[PDB]
mmCIF file of C-alpha atoms and ligand atoms in Angstrom:
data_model
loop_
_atom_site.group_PDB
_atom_site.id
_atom_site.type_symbol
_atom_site.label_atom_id
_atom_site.label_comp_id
_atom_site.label_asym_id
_atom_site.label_seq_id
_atom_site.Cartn_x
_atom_site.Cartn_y
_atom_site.Cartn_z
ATOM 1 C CA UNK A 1 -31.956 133.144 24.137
ATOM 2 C CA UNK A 2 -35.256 132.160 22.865
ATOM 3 C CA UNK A 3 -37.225 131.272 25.295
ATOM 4 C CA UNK A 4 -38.200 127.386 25.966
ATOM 5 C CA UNK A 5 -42.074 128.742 26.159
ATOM 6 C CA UNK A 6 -41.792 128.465 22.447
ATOM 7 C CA UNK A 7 -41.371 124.956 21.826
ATOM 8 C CA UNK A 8 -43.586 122.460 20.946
ATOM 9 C CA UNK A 9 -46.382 122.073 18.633
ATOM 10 C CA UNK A 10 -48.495 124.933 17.911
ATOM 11 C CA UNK A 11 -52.236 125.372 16.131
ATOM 12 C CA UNK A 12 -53.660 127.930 13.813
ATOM 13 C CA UNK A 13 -56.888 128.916 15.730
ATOM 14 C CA UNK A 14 -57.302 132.681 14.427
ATOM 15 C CA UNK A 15 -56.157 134.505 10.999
ATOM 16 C CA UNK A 16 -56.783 138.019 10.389
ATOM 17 C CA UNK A 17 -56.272 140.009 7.083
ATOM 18 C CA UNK A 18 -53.901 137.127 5.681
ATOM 19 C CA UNK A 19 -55.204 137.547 2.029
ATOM 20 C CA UNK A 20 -54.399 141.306 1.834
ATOM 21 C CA UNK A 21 -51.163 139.907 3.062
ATOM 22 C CA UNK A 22 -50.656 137.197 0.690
ATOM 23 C CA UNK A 23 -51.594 139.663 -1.915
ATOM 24 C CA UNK A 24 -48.996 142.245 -0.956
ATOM 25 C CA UNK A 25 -46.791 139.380 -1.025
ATOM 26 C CA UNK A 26 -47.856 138.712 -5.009
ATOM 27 C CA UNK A 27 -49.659 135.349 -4.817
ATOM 28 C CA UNK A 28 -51.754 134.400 -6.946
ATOM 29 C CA UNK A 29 -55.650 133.725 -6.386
ATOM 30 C CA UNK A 30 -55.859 130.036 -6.926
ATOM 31 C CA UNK A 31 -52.745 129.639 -4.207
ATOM 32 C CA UNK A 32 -54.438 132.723 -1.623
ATOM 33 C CA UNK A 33 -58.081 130.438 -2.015
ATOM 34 C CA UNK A 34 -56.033 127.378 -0.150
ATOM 35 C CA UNK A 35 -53.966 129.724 2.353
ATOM 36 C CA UNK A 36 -57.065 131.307 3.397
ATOM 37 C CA UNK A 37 -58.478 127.264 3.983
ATOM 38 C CA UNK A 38 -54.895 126.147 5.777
ATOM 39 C CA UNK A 39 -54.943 125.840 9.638
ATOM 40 C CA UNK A 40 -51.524 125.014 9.690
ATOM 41 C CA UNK A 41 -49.769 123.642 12.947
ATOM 42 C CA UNK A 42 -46.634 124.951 13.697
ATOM 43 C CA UNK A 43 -43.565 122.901 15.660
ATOM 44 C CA UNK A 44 -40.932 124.929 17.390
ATOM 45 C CA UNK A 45 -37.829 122.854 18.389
ATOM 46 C CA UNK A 46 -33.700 123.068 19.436
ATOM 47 C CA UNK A 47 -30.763 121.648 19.019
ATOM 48 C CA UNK A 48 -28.138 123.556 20.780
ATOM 49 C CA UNK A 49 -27.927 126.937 19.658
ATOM 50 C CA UNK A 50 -30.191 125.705 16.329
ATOM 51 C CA UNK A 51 -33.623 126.525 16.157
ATOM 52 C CA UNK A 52 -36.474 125.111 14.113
ATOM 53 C CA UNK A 53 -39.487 126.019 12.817
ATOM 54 C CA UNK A 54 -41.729 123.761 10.944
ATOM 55 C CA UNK A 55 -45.155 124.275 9.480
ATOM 56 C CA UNK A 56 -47.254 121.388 8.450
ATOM 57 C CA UNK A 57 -50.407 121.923 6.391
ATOM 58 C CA UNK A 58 -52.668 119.492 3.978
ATOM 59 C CA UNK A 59 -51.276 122.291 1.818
ATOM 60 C CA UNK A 60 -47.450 123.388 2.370
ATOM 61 C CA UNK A 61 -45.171 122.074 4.506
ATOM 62 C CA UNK A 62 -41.922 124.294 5.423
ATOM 63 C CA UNK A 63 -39.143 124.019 7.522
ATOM 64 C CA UNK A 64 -36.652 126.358 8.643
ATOM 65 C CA UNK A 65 -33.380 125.785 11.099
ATOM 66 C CA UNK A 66 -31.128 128.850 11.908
ATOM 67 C CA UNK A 67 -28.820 130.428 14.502
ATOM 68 C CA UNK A 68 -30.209 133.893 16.261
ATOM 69 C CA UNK A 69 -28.322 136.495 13.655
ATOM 70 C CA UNK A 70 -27.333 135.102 11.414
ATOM 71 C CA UNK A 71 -28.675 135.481 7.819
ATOM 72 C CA UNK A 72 -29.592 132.358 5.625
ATOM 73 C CA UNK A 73 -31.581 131.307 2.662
ATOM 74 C CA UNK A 74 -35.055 130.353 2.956
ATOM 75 C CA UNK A 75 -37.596 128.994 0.625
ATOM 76 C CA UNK A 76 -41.174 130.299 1.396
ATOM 77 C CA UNK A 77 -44.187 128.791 1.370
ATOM 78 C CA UNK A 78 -45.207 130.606 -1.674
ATOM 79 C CA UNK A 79 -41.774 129.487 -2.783
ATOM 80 C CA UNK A 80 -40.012 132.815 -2.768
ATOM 81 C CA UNK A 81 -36.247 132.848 -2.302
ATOM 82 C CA UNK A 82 -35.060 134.974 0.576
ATOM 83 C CA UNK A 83 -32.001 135.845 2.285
ATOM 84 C CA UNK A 84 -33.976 135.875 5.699
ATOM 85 C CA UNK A 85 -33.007 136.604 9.326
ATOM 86 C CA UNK A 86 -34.443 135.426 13.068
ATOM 87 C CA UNK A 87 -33.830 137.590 15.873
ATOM 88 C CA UNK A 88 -35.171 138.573 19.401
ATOM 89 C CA UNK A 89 -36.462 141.783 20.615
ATOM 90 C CA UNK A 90 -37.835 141.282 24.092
ATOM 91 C CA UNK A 91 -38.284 138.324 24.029
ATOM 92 C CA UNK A 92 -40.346 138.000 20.735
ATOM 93 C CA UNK A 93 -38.759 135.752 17.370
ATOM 94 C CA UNK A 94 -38.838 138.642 15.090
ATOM 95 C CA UNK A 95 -37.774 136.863 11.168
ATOM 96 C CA UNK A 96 -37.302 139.067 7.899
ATOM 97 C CA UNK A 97 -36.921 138.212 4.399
ATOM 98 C CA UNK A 98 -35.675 140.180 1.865
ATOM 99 C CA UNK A 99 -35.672 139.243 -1.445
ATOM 100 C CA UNK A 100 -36.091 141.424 -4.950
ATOM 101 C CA UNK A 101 -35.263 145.038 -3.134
ATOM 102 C CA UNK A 102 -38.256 143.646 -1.021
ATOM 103 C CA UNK A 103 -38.841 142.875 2.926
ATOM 104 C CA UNK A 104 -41.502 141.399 4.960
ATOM 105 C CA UNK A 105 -41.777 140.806 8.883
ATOM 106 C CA UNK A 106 -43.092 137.721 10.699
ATOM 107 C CA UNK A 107 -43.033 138.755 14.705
ATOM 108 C CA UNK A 108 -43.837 135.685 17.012
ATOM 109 C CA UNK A 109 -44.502 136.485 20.407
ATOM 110 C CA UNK A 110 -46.029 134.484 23.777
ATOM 111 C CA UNK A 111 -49.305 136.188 24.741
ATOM 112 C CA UNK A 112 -50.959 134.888 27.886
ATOM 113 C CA UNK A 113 -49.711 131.523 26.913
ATOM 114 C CA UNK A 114 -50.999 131.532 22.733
ATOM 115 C CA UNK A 115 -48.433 131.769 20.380
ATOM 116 C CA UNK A 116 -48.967 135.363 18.051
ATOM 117 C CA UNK A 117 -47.635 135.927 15.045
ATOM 118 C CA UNK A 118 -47.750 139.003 12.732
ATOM 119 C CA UNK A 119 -47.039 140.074 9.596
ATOM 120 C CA UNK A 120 -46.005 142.753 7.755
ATOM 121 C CA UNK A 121 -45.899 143.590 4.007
ATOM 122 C CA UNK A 122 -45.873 147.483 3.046
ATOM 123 C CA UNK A 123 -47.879 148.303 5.508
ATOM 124 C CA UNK A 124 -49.978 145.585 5.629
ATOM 125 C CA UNK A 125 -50.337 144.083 8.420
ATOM 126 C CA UNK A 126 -51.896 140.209 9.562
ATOM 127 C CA UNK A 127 -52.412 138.802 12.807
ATOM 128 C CA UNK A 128 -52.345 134.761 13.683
ATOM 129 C CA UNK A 129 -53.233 133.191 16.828
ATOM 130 C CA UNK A 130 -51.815 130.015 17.709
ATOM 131 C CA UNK A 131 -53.025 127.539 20.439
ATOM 132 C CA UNK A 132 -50.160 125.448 22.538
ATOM 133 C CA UNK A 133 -51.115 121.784 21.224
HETATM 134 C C1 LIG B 1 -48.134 127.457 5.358
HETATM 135 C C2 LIG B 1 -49.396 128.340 5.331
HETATM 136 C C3 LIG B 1 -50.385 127.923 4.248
HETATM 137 C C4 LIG B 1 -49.839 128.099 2.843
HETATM 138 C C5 LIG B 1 -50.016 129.499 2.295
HETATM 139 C C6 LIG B 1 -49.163 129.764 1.079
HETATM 140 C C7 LIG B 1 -49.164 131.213 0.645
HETATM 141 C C8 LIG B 1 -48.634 132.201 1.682
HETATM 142 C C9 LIG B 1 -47.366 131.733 2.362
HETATM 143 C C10 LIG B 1 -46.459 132.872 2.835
HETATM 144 C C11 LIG B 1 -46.909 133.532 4.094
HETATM 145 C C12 LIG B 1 -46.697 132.662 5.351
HETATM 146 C C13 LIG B 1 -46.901 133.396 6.660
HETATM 147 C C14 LIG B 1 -47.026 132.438 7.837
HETATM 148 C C15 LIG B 1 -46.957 133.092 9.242
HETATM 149 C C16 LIG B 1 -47.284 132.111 10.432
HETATM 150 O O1 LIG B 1 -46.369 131.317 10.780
HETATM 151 O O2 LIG B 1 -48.463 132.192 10.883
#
């Protein structure tokens, strides 16, 4: 499964190209001006075969808890609702949502010991760097 390298509490140290993203994603300017601020931490946690995510920011807070494959609803940050999906591929947490004949990608991987998420909206493409807090 997931491997316990991922849990714990995470911080936003690095964002690259995450207003193109949020644009391709259809938010608005008011809502991208306080993304682009947020340095959200991130908390990765288990309970048996449930996994958790949860982002805390002076912003948004979100929280998500899910099996590996198997699809449930999500409520975004920007407050879209997706049928969404977390999965591994070598070892990374790769989650899609799909919502309105629409998909992104959020890929978190372990990269000498940082936490790296990207994402992916039609071809867009944003990189995060987390430190392990
Ligand atoms: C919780 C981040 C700050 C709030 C930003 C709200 C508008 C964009 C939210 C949707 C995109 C979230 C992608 C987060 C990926 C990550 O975990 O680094």
């Amino acid at each position: 499964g997931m491997s316990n390298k991922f849990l714990g509490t995470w911080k936003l140290v690095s964002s690259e190209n995450f207003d193109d993203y949020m644009k391709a994603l259809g938010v608005g300017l008011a809502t991208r001006k306080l993304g682009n601020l947020a340095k959200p931490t991130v908390i990765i946690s288990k309970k048996g075969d449930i996994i958790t995510i949860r982002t805390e920011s002076t912003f948004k807070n979100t929280e998500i808890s899910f099996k590996l494959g198997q699809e449930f609803e999500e409520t975004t940050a920007d407050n879209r609702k997706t049928k969404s999906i977390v999965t591994l591929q070598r070892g990374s947490l790769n989650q899609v949502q799909r919502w309105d004949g629409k998909e992104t990608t959020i890929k978190r991987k372990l990269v000498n010991g940082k936490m790296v998420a990207e994402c992916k909206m039609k071809g867009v493409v944003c990189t995060r760097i987390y430190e392990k807090v």
